[PDB]
Write a protein that binds this ligand. Structure first.
Ligand SMILES: Nc1cccc(-c2nc3ncccc3o2)c1
Length: 1105
């Protein structure tokens, strides 16, 4: 009935978990990071983190632990998903190919069972005897680790303690033993049990229970030789080992709850601890010797090390390097020093990794140019709060601009053999060459002895033996560096024109029609080595040396006319090693051998904007795994360049692109420039690490931004942003923010709301939240003004609009007065503000008897939701809000969107409702509601007949009118899809410059994932649904989870297959399967579709984000 397509624009960035161990090999130290559905694998080096493999799971990662059974040469990986898919995984690398093998899998959900409120805990016995899971209160699930248990069959043990806080397996025990903290009416306690595989039951544990602190929250299992357990609370740290009990109460930890730990030393002598304010501590266990050679714990000390991002997880990585995994801010690599700095910190940040999450609100604005949307998010929380400005494509920073038309090629060179930097740029034109010298920033015409100016140059550069080369249509010219003189000249035997040229430091291959000549560069000598006659006219050549080659290529890559082939030839014989026919009647224009992330590729661009690429074996010359993308509609010219110590390929066309590698796959990112015809890298005194760019009329010099799909600007607020709106007439944003103060109440640090240029305060008629409206400049993101709300006043909703016949644009804020014992608020305000002359003036107020959860401008009026009421206000001539009409049939109306006279209302627990304003009756009519209960997080109107909801269990659904009257009032859920993210905000718009899809809705999530929803025809839906089913038969999923299971709508009330939703991430993955697989997919598929049809289809779909 409705057909929707959902695709990832930005993968989740929040770190949900981290572990270290030896997974990729026994001798590698690995960091594994869980980002919701993604697992990232790194090798830890001196240099830092090298990425080796990133995979997606068809599940949310809830447990991630490395372990090593006897007989295994390296660690295996246990994963449990939030839908209770369990697997054991093994890393396998066969040559260049890397695969995650599933050693065991099965689903471990029970039939009855309310998910424990305090979440899934999974733990692994140190001796790998069993995996233990706390999934539900009152039960402990055991998976025995026998070699025969490939289905991960489990049994449940009754657990008398219903409210477990945390649990670990202990070290040094003859039977598998758990230690856990639990809560009962008498307080919190620590207890142990042995786990008997024979009896499938608990036995008495080795040490008796103790009462612990009221807020004891984490258990640490300390390795031998200590053994035992550390229990971390809010004001105490205790150690237990039976006839051993030791407790400290250090004041230094009392300010903020400690929420994560990591073992620094294998023997447990030191642990890192992180708290909710980003403090990093070291916990030190002091040893005492004993006559019998055991070691017991003498004392415990805690030392403040410094400050990090607020850590969800910590991993020590050796040599003082710590990974800080953050959910609420950026993740980091930090270094711990033995000696402190000026301010007394041992912590120095080394590297920052972007986290957009949580995205709590966002808007789309054309900040810089018309038609180019940028997303501005409210990101992070507490000291990590920020605005983030997100935009597609890679920028260039122009540093020079010369009027100079007709350029046909650019080459840099070093005219001085004693200087490392380029000082010369050679330009070709039709039939001519010009040399430009660079003196700092000055760029000046000149001659260069040895080079000719009256022929077109096809290549020039530095070559071996301190020489320069120029290849023109007439000859190859070899020039000495000191002095500049012609030392050798090569011409074809009858002096026919050269038509194509390739060159490296010591080798030359030139074409003359169908003839090829191979030359070597020697001292004062161009030596002709060999020649051949190709079957067809030569279109393009490359001899870029790859790998451990010593600057020499044994291969020549060639593109031919007529048969449209890309071929690899051996030098010097010119023997054919491999031929690929590219199809069509349009010749290759650019061919390049290149390396990315240590793998070799052949790139071949046609004159129609097609780019083919292949794996290249530089030993055998074999091309494999052909792929194709379209980079424009014009001939593309390819050229290698380096930035940030990485070689990439710049593709010149009508749509300039950078080609690079990410997770050992080629990626393509737009450069934000108009048409570029030619380019070369340029690294001169005045223009270090730059690019020279030419179009039809202009030569530019500039630097390039980071090579990535999306560019992100961060604006730190040092406090929690809550909502955002743009006010075009003021050229600024309004942002609701809150900061924590401690009760007179005192602030913890300066932040946006206490550092505005000017400030104002409302006048009345982790201790406390103080709320503010910030006014922020759209260009500088400076905080121009901050208005502080009343004590106990929480700002919930924000809109920028005009009302009635009043020409002013206002910022309007809806609030709640929050008191401790109230089930919900019974008081709040709507406040209308005018931003004028650097400050917010209060124009009007309205007291209401509830929380103002949501507001929208509606046909020149103000729509607001207040507790269980939706209300429409008019703006009177006396500049006051006056109630027009009310709707009462809600539990708690949290979310509003409107289109025309229609209003979509999202409820706390009864899903969505459609209202209409009746302009000829001045009131609301309830049109229809979704009678299925759903706990809503966000809503959006897709169009007049289709309503999108997100709910708290990470599902999307789509409702439509069912086209009796009682019947017309029943909205139908026609689309269902498990997304696996928590949606905070939907907003209409696109990051692409303004096909199979209609409409564009972006969403922002808690994990900092950004998605897109668009609409499909029935026809397109049917084709893509068929593709999915076929893809699902050929793709091997990690952990052998079925895609259909993953995407099934799932709440406590209802599990059903997905319907009316295409998984764009799955569809896009078609462009990464093998050619056989594509054939399997494309067989007997409705017109009988071919692989190459689908490739093109999936490209039109990738361009929507
Ligand atoms: N050297 C290198 C290259 C590319 C990506 C990364 C990286 N991205 C991360 N995101 C979160 C946490 C840790 C991370 O490390 C690191």
């Amino acid at each position: 009935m409705s057909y929707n397509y959902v695709v990832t624009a930005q993968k989740p960035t929040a770190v949900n978990g981290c572990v270290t161990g030896h997974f990729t090999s026994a001798e590698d130290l690995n960091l594994l990071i869980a980002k919701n559905t993604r697992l990232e694998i790194y090798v830890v080096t001196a240099e830092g983190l090298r990425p080796v493999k990133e995979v997606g799971m068809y599940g949310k990662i809830a447990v991630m632990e490395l372990f090593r059974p006897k007989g295994e040469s390296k660690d295996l990986l246990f994963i449990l998903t939030a839908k209770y898919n369990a697997c054991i995984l093994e890393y396998k690398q066969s040559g260049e190919s890397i695969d995650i093998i599933t050693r065991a899998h099965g689903n471990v959900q029970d039939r009855i069972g309310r998910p424990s409120e305090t979440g899934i805990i999974g733990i692994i016995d140190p001796e790998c005897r069993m995996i233990g899971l706390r999934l539900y209160d009152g039960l402990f699930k055991v998976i025995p680790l026998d070699r025969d248990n490939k289905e991960l069959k489990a049994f449940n043990i009754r657990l008398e303690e219903l409210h477990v806080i945390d649990v670990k397996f202990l070290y040094g025990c003859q039977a598998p033993t758990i230690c856990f903290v639990y809560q009962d009416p008498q307080g919190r306690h620590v207890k142990t049990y042995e786990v008997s595989l024979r009896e499938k039951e608990f036995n008495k544990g080795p040490w008796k229970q103790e009462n612990v602190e009221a807020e004891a929250s984490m258990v640490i299992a300390v390795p031998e030789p200590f053994g035992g357990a550390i229990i971390i609370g809010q004001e105490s740290i205790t150690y237990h080992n039976g006839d051993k009990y030791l407790a400290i109460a250090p004041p230094i930890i009392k300010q903020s709850t400690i929420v994560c730990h990591n073992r620094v030393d294998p023997n447990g002598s030191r642990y890192l601890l992180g708290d909710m304010e980003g403090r990093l501590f070291m916990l030190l266990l002091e040893k005492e010797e004993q006559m019998d050679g055991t070691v017991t714990l003498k004392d415990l000390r805690v030392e403040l090390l410094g400050e990090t991002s607020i850590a969800e997880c910590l991993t020590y990585l050796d040599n003082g390097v710590v990974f800080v995994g953050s959910r609420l801010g950026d993740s980091q690599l930090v270094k711990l020093n033995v000696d402190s700095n000026e301010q007394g910190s041992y912590v120095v940040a080394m590297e920052t990794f972007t986290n957009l999450g949580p995205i709590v609100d966002m808007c789309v604005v054309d900040l810089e140019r018309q038609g180019q949307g940028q997303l501005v998010t409210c990101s992070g929380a507490f000291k990590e709060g920020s605005l983030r400005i997100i935009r597609n494509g890679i920028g260039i920073h122009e540093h020079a601009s010369i009027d100079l038309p007709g350029i046909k090629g650019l080459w840099p060179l070093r005219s001085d053999p004693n200087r490392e930097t380029d000082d010369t740029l050679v330009l070709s034109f039709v039939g001519q060459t010009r040399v430009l010298m660079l003196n700092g920033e000055e760029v000046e015409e000149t001659e260069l002895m040895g080079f000719v100016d009256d022929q077109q140059t096809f290549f020039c550069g530095n070559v071996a033996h301190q020489q320069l080369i120029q290849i023109t249509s007439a000859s190859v010219r070899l020039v000495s560096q000191e002095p500049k003189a012609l030392v050798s000249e090569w011409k074809e035997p009858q002096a026919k024109n050269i038509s194509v040229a390739s060159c490296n430091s010591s080798q030359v291959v030139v074409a003359v029609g169908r003839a090829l000549y191979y030359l070597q560069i020697h001292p004062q000598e161009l030596r002709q080595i060999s020649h051949t006659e190709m079957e067809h006219e030569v279109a393009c050549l490359d001899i870029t040396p790859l790998g451990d080659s010593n600057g020499l290529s044994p291969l020549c890559a060639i593109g031919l006319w007529t048969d449209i082939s890309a071929r690899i030839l051996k030098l010097p014989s010119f023997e054919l090693l491999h031929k690929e026919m590219l199809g069509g009647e349009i010749i290759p224009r650019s061919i390049l051998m290149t390396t990315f992330e240590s793998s070799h590729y052949l790139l071949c661009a046609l004159g129609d904007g097609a780019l083919f690429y292949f794996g290249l074996n530089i030993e055998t010359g074999l091309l494999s795994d052909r792929k194709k993308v379209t980079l424009g509609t014009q001939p593309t010219v390819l050229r290698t360049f380096r930035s940030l110590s990485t070689t990439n390929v710049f593709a010149c066309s009508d749509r300039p692109t950078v080609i690079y590698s990410s997770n050992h796959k080629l990626v393509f990112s737009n450069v934000n420039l108009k048409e570029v015809n030619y380019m070369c890298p340029l690294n001169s005194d005045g223009y270090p690490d730059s690019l020279a760019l030419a179009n039809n009329s202009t030569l530019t010099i500039g630097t390039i931004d980071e090579i990535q799909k999306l560019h992100i600007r961060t604006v730190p607020l040092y406090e929690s942003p809550r909502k955002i709106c743009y006010q075009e007439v003021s050229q600024c944003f309004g942002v609701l923010s809150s900061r924590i103060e401690v009760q007179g109440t005192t602030a913890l640090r300066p932040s946006a709301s206490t550092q505005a240029l000017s400030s104002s305060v409302s006048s009345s008629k982790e201790e406390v939240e103080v709320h503010n409206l910030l006014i922020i400049d759209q260009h500088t993101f400076e905080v121009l003004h901050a208005h502080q709300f009343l004590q106990n006043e929480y700002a919930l909703s924000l809109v920028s609009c005009k009302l009635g016949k009043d020409p002013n644009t206002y910022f309007i804020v809806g609030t709640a007065m929050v008191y401790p014992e109230e089930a919900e608020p019974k008081q709040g305000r709507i406040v209308v503000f005018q931003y004028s002359d650097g400050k917010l003036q209060t124009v009007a107020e309205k007291e209401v008897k509830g929380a103002v959860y949501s507001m929208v401008e509606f046909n020149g009026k103000l729509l607001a939701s207040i507790n269980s009421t939706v209300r429409l206000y008019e703006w009177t001539t006396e500049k006051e809000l006056r109630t027009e009409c009310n709707h009462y049939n809600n539990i708690m109306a949290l979310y509003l969107k409107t289109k025309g006279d229609f209003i979509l209302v999202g409820d706390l627990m009864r899903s969505v409702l459609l209202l209409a304003y009746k302009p000829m009756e001045g009131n609301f009519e309830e049109i229809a509601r979704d009678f299925n209960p759903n706990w809503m997080s966000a809503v959006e109107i897709l169009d007049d007949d289709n309503f999108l909801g997100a709910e708290n269990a990470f599902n999307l659904f789509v409702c439509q009118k069912d086209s009796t009257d009682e019947e017309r009032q029943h909205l139908q859920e026609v689309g269902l899809f498990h997304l696996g993210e928590f949606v905070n905000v939907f907003c209409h718009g696109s990051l692409v410059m303004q096909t199979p899809t209609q409409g564009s809705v972006l969403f922002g999530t808690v994990n900092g994932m950004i998605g897109l929803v668009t609409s499909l025809s029935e026809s397109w839906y049917n084709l893509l649904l068929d593709m999915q089913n076929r893809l699902n038969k050929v793709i091997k999923s990690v952990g052998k989870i079925e895609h259909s299971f993953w995407r099934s709508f799932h709440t406590e009330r209802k599990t059903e297959p997905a319907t009316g939703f295409i998984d764009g991430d799955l569809i896009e993955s078609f462009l990464d399967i093998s050619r056989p697989k594509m054939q399997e997919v494309v067989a007997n598929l409705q017109r009988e579709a071919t692989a190459d049809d689908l490739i093109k289809v999936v490209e039109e779909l990738t361009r929507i984000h």
